[PDB]
Amino acid sequence: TQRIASHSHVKGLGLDESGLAKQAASGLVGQENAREACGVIVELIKSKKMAGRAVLLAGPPGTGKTALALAIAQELGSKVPFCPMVGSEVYSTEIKKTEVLMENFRRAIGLRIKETKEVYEGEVTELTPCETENPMGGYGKTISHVIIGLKTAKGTKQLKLDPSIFESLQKERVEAGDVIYIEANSGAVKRQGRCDTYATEFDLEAEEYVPLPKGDVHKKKEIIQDVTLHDLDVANARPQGGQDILSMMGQLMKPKKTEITDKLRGEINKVVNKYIDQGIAELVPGVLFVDEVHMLDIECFTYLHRALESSIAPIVIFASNRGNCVIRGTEDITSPHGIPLDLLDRVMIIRTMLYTPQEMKQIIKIRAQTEGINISEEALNHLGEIGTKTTLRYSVQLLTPANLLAKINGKDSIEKEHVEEISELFYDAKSSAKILADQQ
Amino acid sequence: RIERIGAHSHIRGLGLDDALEPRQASQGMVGQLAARRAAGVVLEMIREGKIAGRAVLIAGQPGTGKTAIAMGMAQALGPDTPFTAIAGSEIFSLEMSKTEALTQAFRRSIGVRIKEETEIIEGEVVEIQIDRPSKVGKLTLKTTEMETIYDLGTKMIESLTKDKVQAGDVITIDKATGKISKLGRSFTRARDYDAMGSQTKFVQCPDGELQKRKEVVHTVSLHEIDVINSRTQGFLALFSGDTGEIKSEVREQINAKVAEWREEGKAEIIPGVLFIDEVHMLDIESFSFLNRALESDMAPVLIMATNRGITRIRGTSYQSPHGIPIDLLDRLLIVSTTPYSEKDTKQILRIRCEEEDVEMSEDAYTVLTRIGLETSLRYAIQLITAASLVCRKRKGTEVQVDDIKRVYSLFLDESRSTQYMKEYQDA
């Protein structure tokens, strides 16, 4: 279990197979015209091709914007990457805004990579040679292979390795009766240590003591990692290497954290294209959610509608609560949604409609069902009524304190008097503004 | 393999002839004949590359193909010639000045190509014998034409053992530096599988002569040169963009040494192009520095996109066309892009829907051209992908007019969004 968040109730868009919207499926009620609109871009995302697209969910504050924007992520599943970022995270003190934007852009892009490796494990029993005639003048007989006996919890098996592996063994300095790990594709050998079956009574030598090597002596299992392109970026930018004093600067916070296009193009993209065409990694193009995009400035918008035209960028979902407002960063330039007209003419717009009394009542019911509150039918109607006056946010936030008052007064369901008392103990934006205007 | 089709992925180059005569709808581009011909003239002057520091300004209405012409020039110029695309807002950094960022952007599109004739030895190792007492040994190199033997030295054996090359392996040996590079495994590289082997990727043995003299080329930009010469940390080009090279001998020395190299025939020059999209973001300081940065002999050509008209210059209150001061506007040659007509919008939509692999009906094209002439061509283009998804959802074959109409009613453009913004909407 975990904390109940403000959007823990949404699980999907609840759309029919034909593309139509259901009444209250997947926790989302009403909002058909916008849920279908965003289900269309859900299928766009599923179609990994046709990238470099942007969609702007615009509307009054808090109607359904964030709810359906993150329900897009639930419909898409955790498999595809969905990177959220509020418009206020662009301003940084150690890196530039156009670089934060590029990082988030090619951070939303995922890249899952598969690889199959064979592995060995088991307490070695003994090593012996395979003698053979001299390939050259009679200086002595040579060795062709080395037989090694590995014992595990399943059984004991003998295996043949090449003389190079025996030389690796010699320079590794293992003996008979220790735990070793071998791989055939690479050829490296790892010394795990002594086995627990030979555990000591007193000896204090700590080596992460290897327990009984449970399992077969040979095991093949596929590894499937989920790495993003920004992970590779940061790893190649500040590598955590060994004794390479260029790397020993990890003792610094290292400001000046911007990347370089030379690298970004010539080093990281080639290695990904090679893996994709070879069959080692599958590209998982993703979504970049930007709520409160109105906070971005003119420079951020200009960079946004230059990067969006890139063939590599993921699909972007902006959100807007403002109307005809001034563009931040400029002196006085009023444009719709606080977004410049040049960027607005490049993104698809979806108007999030306003809710009716019945729709807000259904939303309150769903939120009460999610928060585990046993609201009664009278308290629900009163919440609907007093939420038709104010906004939906205040109407639905009066469920935790009402339930607490109920539990304290010895109840198991929110009654009418409880919500009536909470509505008088707490106020909303308009009620508070009225008192503020009445006072000096 | 998988690099999605962006907004500008449909143009593969300017549709020009040998005499720089723009064709109507060839090579992805459509209409815009005058601006395409100007783009071709400047591209020919670029491919010539005996004049440095020339500026062009592609001005025009929003969504008329300015960035399209820029990407077309980039594609027609192809590799082996630096083309750096930058938005005007990308130079506003926190760790380096605007002038330093502009110097970086310029010097990043200037290529220096050192051509070397280092000889090597390419063949398929047959045997690698070595006896440790300094250890001494021999190697048998085979090519399809001949076989030979070599006595391996101390460091030769050291490098061979470090690289772990074995028999049947095809390798190349830089005799000057001794650098080894194994290219693959030959059919002989078969290890007679009787042990933990998991590699069987064979390849043909090298053909030709044993000890051949091939030609290598090392191409690096003046930006990379000065970056790696700045300080002992010769990895800032990948490590991080932490920079600030003083304009002392470092850059002047790069320039002087590249001049001597060009004179002595080591590496002469390959000029480049700098596409500044949305140049109106640059500051008055940026313009004032560019004024004289375009005068340097190591200055590549630049093309600046413009949507603005008579508007104040950023960082001041001076009204100037293109949002650029006349001081800099005087160096530029201005090319104006005109709006697309009905048949041009229709052809652009057709090429775009054929590039993104979406079959539209004859009436779908008509209704989409109507929507794109009443509203923005960009909105009309974005409508195609959205309309194809409803068709695929209903299990159709080609986009009809009803799907495009459903998508138009479902998604809103800027004008209809503004007209729907009838409420306060938290202004």
């Binding site: 390939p135 040579t142 | 045997e127 690698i128 014998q129």
Partner: peptide, 13 residues
């Protein structure tokens, strides 16, 4: 005394 010999022959492909 301790003369080692590392070899790698191309058996008859």
């Amino acid at each position: 005394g301790p003369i080692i010999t590392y070899h790698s022959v191309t058996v008859p492909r």
